[PDB]
């Protein structure tokens, strides 16, 4: 006859949720991500290829993207907790035009000091986007935008916002399955699976309408969407050739520190050296059109012989209507209207520098996670700053038209902040290993 036997360490698994811990090449200056407290990554991470194995993946229903979003938000608040709170900055501001070019305002206002029985009158420039008029009259009066909803916390100047890579690892008794299928769209049964105890270097780069410093497609421009035919679902596309983008802040400000209270100070831009210059970003036109034509023809496969037409983003908040990013200290907000402005036919071929220019705006008071209140004041970085990024992905949205026309418009939509993480975690999934297995055999012989 046969007897039931139990096998320990059987190679089986199931989908499960767990608390993933961080791992990093620790090496020092601190960062907003607090990677100094993270576990040190191994020098030679182990990766194994599963033969004869095919596993199902679902990047939209993945739990890693949701868990990482909470961790990033938690780390963001943790770094701002010990910094000074700009509670006395909520006062009437008297501004005048600086000595378009009206982006700045030379404001003056009263302020306290270490001595409680004494006050001081100071002055400092302020971007127009960070100021709101009071009474809608008497142009001199002005108020900080966040003042009537929350008191923003000044970021500590000692910590930098460098997005160094961080590896997400699973606890003992769990594993992360990686799909190595060529040109995998992120959903379906993967024909080339592999396992790894920790994900590759994930850089928590925050961007809208354009993924920067992200992964690159191996051989072909990949497109991902839970429902391509649905106009209410964001469309993520990954490029094969990185499109280098240059940015600069020609304004040369002077950092001035004023002590608002005992043992604390507020940083602001004192004056400006030279004439006022608008901030912008550059990108090669030849290497940009090309990407589109390739993206346009690729999108054509999912909509018949229809012509693709990219148009500038729809109206709304500045965070969603412009390409937001950060050059390691300053939050930028560029137009992008110059990149998604063209029409491609079923034969349209793109066929010198001629670099495109994107005007940009800069703000100090920001809401990175779109939460009510909980704002942060970004101190000004002294001197001119420049930063180059690698554009590897785009966030597109299809207009909700009747679809019966001979074309279709695509708008660069900001989507959700979680989409940025989903573009990199699509090649992973966490599973729980059940080493206890049962099977029969003619034992007891």
């Amino acid at each position: 006859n046969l007897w039931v036997t139990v096998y320990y360490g059987v190679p089986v698994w199931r989908d499960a949720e767990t608390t993933l811990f961080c791992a990093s090449d620790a090496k020092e200056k601190h960062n907003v991500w607090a990677t100094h407290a993270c576990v040190p990554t191994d020098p030679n991470p182990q990766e194994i290829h599963l033969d004869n194995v095919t596993e199902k993946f679902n990047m939209w229903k993945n739990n890693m993207v949701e868990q990482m979003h909470t961790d990033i938000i938690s780390l963001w608040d943790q770094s701002l907790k010990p910094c000074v709170k700009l509670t006395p900055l909520c006062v009437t501001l008297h501004c005048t035009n600086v000595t378009d070019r009206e982006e700045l305002k030379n404001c003056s206002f009263n302020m306290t000091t270490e001595l409680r029985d004494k006050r001081q009158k100071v002055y400092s420039l302020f971007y127009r986007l960070d100021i709101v008029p009071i009474n809608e009259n008497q142009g001199s009066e002005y108020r900080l935008i966040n003042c009537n909803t929350s008191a923003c916390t000044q970021a500590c100047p000692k910590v930098s916002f460098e997005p160094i890579p961080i590896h997400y690892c699973a606890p003992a008794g769990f594993a992360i399955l990686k799909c190595k299928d060529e040109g995998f769209n992120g959903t379906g049964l993967c024909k080339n699976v592999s396992t790894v105890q920790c994900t590759h270097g994930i850089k928590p780069v925050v961007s809208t309408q354009l993924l920067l410093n992200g992964s690159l497609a191996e051989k072909n421009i990949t497109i991902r969407s839970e429902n391509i035919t649905n106009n209410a679902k964001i469309i993520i596309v990954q490029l094969v050739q990185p499109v280098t983008i240059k940015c600069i802040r020609p304004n040369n400000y002077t950092r001035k520190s004023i002590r608002i209270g005992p043992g604390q100070a507020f940083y602001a831009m004192g004056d400006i050296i030279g004439d006022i210059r608008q901030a912008h970003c550059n990108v090669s036109r030849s290497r940009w059109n090309k990407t589109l034509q390739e993206v346009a023809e690729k999108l054509r496969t999912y909509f018949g012989n229809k012509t693709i037409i990219f148009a500038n983003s729809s109206g709304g908040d500045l965070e969603i209507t412009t390409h937001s990013f950060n050059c390691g200290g300053e939050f930028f907000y560029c137009n992008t209207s110059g990149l998604f402005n063209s029409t491609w036919y079923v034969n349209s071929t793109w066929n010198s520098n001629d670099t495109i220019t994107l005007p940009c705006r800069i703000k100090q008071i920001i809401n990175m996670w779109q939460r009510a209140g909980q704002c942060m004041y970004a101190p000004p970085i002294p001197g001119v700053i420049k930063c180059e990024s690698n554009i590897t992905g785009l966030l597109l949205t299809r207009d909700g038209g009747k679809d019966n026309n001979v074309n279709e418009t695509f708008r660069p939509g900001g989507g959700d902040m979680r989409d940025n993480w989903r573009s990199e975690l699509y090649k992973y999934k966490v599973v729980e290993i059940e080493p206890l297995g049962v099977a029969p055999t003619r034992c007891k012989r």
Partner: protein, 127 residues
């Protein structure tokens, strides 16, 4: 010699040769900051211990602790699976077999405890 979890696609008969690598990886800065990363690491370490103990305690009561393979006294009921021994041990893999016993897994576990406990009482306890 395949790495950890490398014999998942192999047949059931060939997968039993590497049980040691999977059983070894079940549990593999001294200070703790109790921060965002520290809190998660603490939960991960505690969760790992519970996962191993929860799975290890079953072998102890079943009388198979310290053994990678063991045979129980519970006979194999044909109702759970009427497939032959050759196909399961030389053609089917563990993943496919997992989706066939899952329904009767809880019942099998309960039957093994009473089968081992009764034999334990019958053998020992001379009076």
């Amino acid at each position: 010699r395949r790495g950890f979890l490398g014999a998942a696609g192999s047949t059931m008969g060939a997968a039993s040769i590497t049980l040691t690598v999977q059983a070894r990886q079940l549990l593999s800065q001294h200070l703790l900051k109790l921060g965002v990363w520290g809190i998660k690491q603490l939960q991960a370490r505690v969760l790992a211990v519970e996962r191993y103990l929860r799975d290890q305690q079953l072998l102890g009561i079943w009388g198979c602790s310290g053994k990678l393979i063991c045979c129980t006294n519970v006979p194999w009921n044909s109702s759970w699976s009427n497939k032959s021994l050759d196909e399961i041990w030389n053609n089917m893999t563990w993943l496919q077999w997992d989706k066939e016993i899952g329904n009767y897994t809880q019942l099998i576990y309960r039957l093994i405890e009473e089968s081992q406990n009764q034999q334990e009482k019958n053998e020992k306890e001379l009076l």
